[PDB]
From a paper:
Human [name] (hA3G) is a member of apolipoprotein B mRNA editing enzyme catalytic polypeptide like (APOBEC) family, and is one of the most effective antiviral host restriction factors against exogenous retroviral pathogens such as human immunodeficiency virus type 1 (HIV-1) and endogenous retroviral derived remnants on the human genome. hA3G is a DNA/RNA cytidine deaminase converting 3′ target cytidine (C) in 5′-CC-3′ or 5′-CCC-3′ motif to uridine (U) within single-stranded DNA (ssDNA)9–15 or single-stranded RNA ([name]). hA3G has two cytidine deaminase domains in tandem, the N-terminal CD1 (or NTD) and C-terminal CD2 (or CTD). The ability to bind nucleic acids and form oligomerization is attributed mainly to CD1/NTD (referred to as CD1 hereafter), while deaminase activity is performed by CD2/CTD (referred to as CD2 hereafter). In this study, we describe four structures of a soluble primate rA3G variant from rhesus macaque, rA3GR8/E259A, in complex with AA and GA dinucleotide-containing RNA molecules in the form of [name] and dsRNA with 5′- or 3′-overhangs.
The third complex of rA3G with RNA3-AAxtal was determined as a monomer with one rA3GR8/E259A molecule binding to one [name] molecule at 2.10 Å. The electron density of RNA was sufficiently featured for building 6-nt: 5′-U4A5A6U7U8U9-3′ out of the 10-nt 5′-U1U2U3U4A5A6U7U8U9U10-3′. About 47% of the resolved 6-nt [name] surface area is buried, with most of the rA3G-[name] contacts placed around AA dinucleotides and on the CD1 domain, which is consistent with the findings from the two rA3GR8/E259A-dsRNA complexes described above. 3′A6 in the AA (or A5A6) dinucleotide is bound to an aromatic/hydrophobic “cave”, a pocket outside but right next to the zinc-center of CD1, forming strong hydrophobic interactions with the solvation energy effect of −2.47 kcal/mol. This pocket is largely preformed and comprised of mainly hydrophobic and aromatic residues: 25PILS28 from loop 1, Y59 from loop 3, W94 from loop 5, and 123LYYFW127 from loop 7. Inside the pocket, there are four hydrogen bonds formed (bond lengths 2.8−3.1 Å) between N1, N6, and N7 nitrogen atoms of 3′A6 and the carbonyl and amide groups within CD1-loop 1 (P25, L27, along the Hoogsteen edge of adenine) and loop 7 (L123, Y125, along the Watson–Crick edge of adenine), fitting 3′A6 base snugly into the pocket. 5’A5 in the AA (or A5A6) dinucleotide is bound to a groove conformed by the CD1 and CD2, also forming strong hydrophobic interactions with the solvation energy effect of −3.09 kcal/mol. One hydrogen bond is formed between N6 nitrogen atom of 5’A5 and the main-chain carbonyl group of F268 (bond length 2.8 Å). U4 at the 5’-end of the AA dinucleotide core structure is held between R24 and S28 on the rA3G surface, suggesting a none-base specific binding with the solvation energy effect of 3.05 kcal/mol.
Residue numbers in the entry: 4 to 142, 147 to 380
The structure:
Amino acid sequence: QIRNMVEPMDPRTFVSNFNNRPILSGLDTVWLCCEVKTKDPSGPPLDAKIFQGKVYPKAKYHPEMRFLRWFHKWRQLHHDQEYKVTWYVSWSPCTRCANSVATFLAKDPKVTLTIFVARLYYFWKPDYQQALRILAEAGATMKIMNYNEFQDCWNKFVDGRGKPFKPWNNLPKHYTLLQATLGELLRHLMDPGTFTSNFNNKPWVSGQHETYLCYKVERLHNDTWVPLNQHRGFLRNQAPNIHGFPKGRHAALCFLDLIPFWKLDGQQYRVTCFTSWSPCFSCAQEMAKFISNNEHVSLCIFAARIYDDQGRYQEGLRTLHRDGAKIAMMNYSEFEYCWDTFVDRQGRPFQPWDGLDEHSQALSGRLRAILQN
RNA sequence: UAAUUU
Ligand SMILES: [Zn+2]
Ligand SMILES: [Zn+2]
């Protein structure tokens, strides 16, 4: 049993080190809770361990490297078989550890590794982004710890004395910022079937209401809009969950959450989102507030379909337009751009669905009628 | 809280 395999850490140690506030000073130690399991999950781990290591000065003593050494010796002492390793790490790997683990995984196909990270270390630095991409390309599955992973870590590796895990304030908001940033820096691409299903602009027949949203940023330079390749990606709405957002968080609000997190300077920026549903009234109100907030940012909203929220959505779109947002229905060129840019297309060109242009024209006429009232 | 990497 795990509590017999690990010496559980102090609750104060866990809460202070795994707090997922993305920008957090003072934490000079990395913590790593790991389980080693067989191909079959659904058991106690073969073994479990807690490693720690000071961030500075010697990366050779970071817990990732302590794990590699311990796991080498451990595998010597147990009958060989394929292993599934899981880490909960308080900080994501530094460039040296990311490269060492990537080398280890690439040279050993019998081992697969999943890394849940509480916070992203130096996510804004190109070297760290590149090293995490190298780790991903070696096979490591990298994810941000959410409530379930924090709770699992609490249950397995913390001396909670039977008390349940108590989430700190803003755990879900921090989670969404970090997950979007991880998607950006790993350059996650949308699944092609997911894109085609959600961005088809014929009248919607599915019972699902979900919103997918692709985003990019441009900077004004010498009177020309130039690309800002850093902040490009996609996201979706957060369905309601009492451990996350109890009333949900719509895709447009998650998008708005991202913009201050980018820490844009005073230059002129044009932020564009391609959203499968036009925003509901609440989303449009919040976007209008943001526009009134950040004059150095111009919003361009392209929508695949018009979402009738059974309420004030027309007034919402009119308010958004009145406040300076560019709102347009997506036409062929916008769909093709999103296919080429955000989708895991694997060389395949954009294949438009039936009636794309006709549905675009109908929806464009509807949008024009809404905005002219 | 943009957070000491030899
Ligand atoms: Zn390291
Ligand atoms: Zn909405």
